[PDB]
Amino acid sequence: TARTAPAGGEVRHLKMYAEKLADGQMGYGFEKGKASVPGPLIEVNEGDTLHIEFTNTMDVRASLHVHGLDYEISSDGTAMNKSDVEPGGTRTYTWRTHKPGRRDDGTWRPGSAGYWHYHDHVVGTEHGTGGIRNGLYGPVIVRRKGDVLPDATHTIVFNDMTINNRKPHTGPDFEATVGDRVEIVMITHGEYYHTFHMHGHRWADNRTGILTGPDDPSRVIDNKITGPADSFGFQIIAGEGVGAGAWMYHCHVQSHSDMGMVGLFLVKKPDGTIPGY
């Protein structure tokens, strides 16, 4: 049987930093000097509370704003609600999550589980346009009790005309072995719509990207249109039914793929070989 998420409800603490990078970009990190674009993955269980002690090490105001999770207005990360952070400053954001359940009126409250993201809200403009452009974005995953955990999680961010703020035609590339349970968090940012596509693999267009059984009528797809701040996620079995290979993923907007929005899902045999590579 596959590994599954346990019941949540833990209180968790975390240090996060905003850093200007030597190349001019901006990244979050869990450790000073180890910021990355995209930011590090934050993964919690429904019901967990997360207290992020955030330090802006930059010379400009910056913030943390999250999608999907519960937060009070004092943690929405906006200038308006006095929730950004001054240069050199520290603030504790609090993110909460909740489980689904029946309300008193008989309705069904949705849980927090899903594929989400965090990003800056005040660099460049009051909507973080400069922050996002420079790399201040990262993924968040909230797990429901009992759903399936992967062998590894990769984050693919279409940010304007870049993948993960990389130069055209520089990946990123990811590697797996035939049979691995691979998870993708797919996030879009900036100005343009895109269509995300994988060669040789497909997934369900629902909450987890996975069907639990035969009753789910969700479309099975390998192409999906996305816009700025959209986030979705899915799991695949690397090479399932198709074998080892250098499997392209790309934006399928023709000029975008032509201009470098391309990468490789490198699925290897156990000996490491990739047919045709």
How near is the Cβ of 209 to a second copy at its closest, in Å?
A: 9
- Given the rule CB under 8 A, which of 6-14, 15-23, 48-56, 220-228 is the region that contacts a second copy? 220-228
Place of tokens 């590579």: 277
CA gap 257, 243 in Å, rounded: 24
| x/- map, 120-159, a second copy, by CB under 8 A | -----xxxxx--xx--------------x-----------
CA gap 16, 36 in Å, rounded: 11
Residue-by-residue DSSP string for 118-152 = EE-SSSSSTT-HHHHHHT-EEEEEEEPTTPBPPSE
- Given the rule CB under 8 A, which of 10-18, 21-29, 47-55, 199-207 is the region that contacts a second copy? 199-207
List Cα–Cα distances, 192 to 77, 161, 162, 172, 274, in angstroms: 24, 8, 11, 20, 34
CA gap 240, 183 in Å, rounded: 14
**Which listed residue (245, 249, 263, 266) binds a second copy by CB under 8 A?**
245
How near is the Cβ of 190 to a second copy at its closest, in Å?
A: 6
**Which listed residue (66, 253, 262, 267) binds Cu ion by CB under 5 A?**
253
List Cα–Cα distances, 122 to 63, 118, 134, 166, 226, in angstroms: 6, 13, 12, 23, 23
| x/- map, 43-72, a second copy, by CB under 8 A | ------------------------xx-xxx
- The answer for residues whose C-beta is within 8 angstroms of residue 89's C-beta and 6 or more apart is 55, 56
- Rule CB under 8 A: say whether 174 interacts with a second copy: no
Return the number of other C-beta atoms located less than 10 Å from residue 45's C-beta: 21
- Rule CB under 5 A: say whether 224 interacts with Cu ion: no
- Given the rule CB under 8 A, which of 17-25, 45-53, 85-93, 229-237 is the region that contacts a second copy? 229-237
**Residues annotated in the binding site for Cu(2+), as ranges?**
65, 67, 119, 121, 194, 197, 199, 250-252, 256
Residue 5 or 188 with smaller CB distance to Cu ion: 188
Residue-by-residue DSSP string for 205-219 = SSSSSS--STT--PP
- Rule CB under 5 A: say whether 5 interacts with Cu ion: no
Q: Which helix (H) or strand (E) holds 102?
A: strand 101-102
Q: How many residues bind a second copy (CB under 8 A)?
A: 96
- Rule CB under 8 A: say whether 270 interacts with a second copy: no
- Given the rule CB under 8 A, which of 20-28, 38-46, 85-93, 234-242 is the region that contacts a second copy? 234-242
Residue 30 or 99 with smaller CB distance to a second copy: 99
CB 32 within 8 A of CB 17: yes
Q: Which of residues 78-107 bind a second copy (CB under 8 A)?
A: 78, 80-83, 96, 98, 100, 102, 105-107
Residue 29 or 251 with smaller CB distance to a second copy: 251
Count of residues for the chain?
277
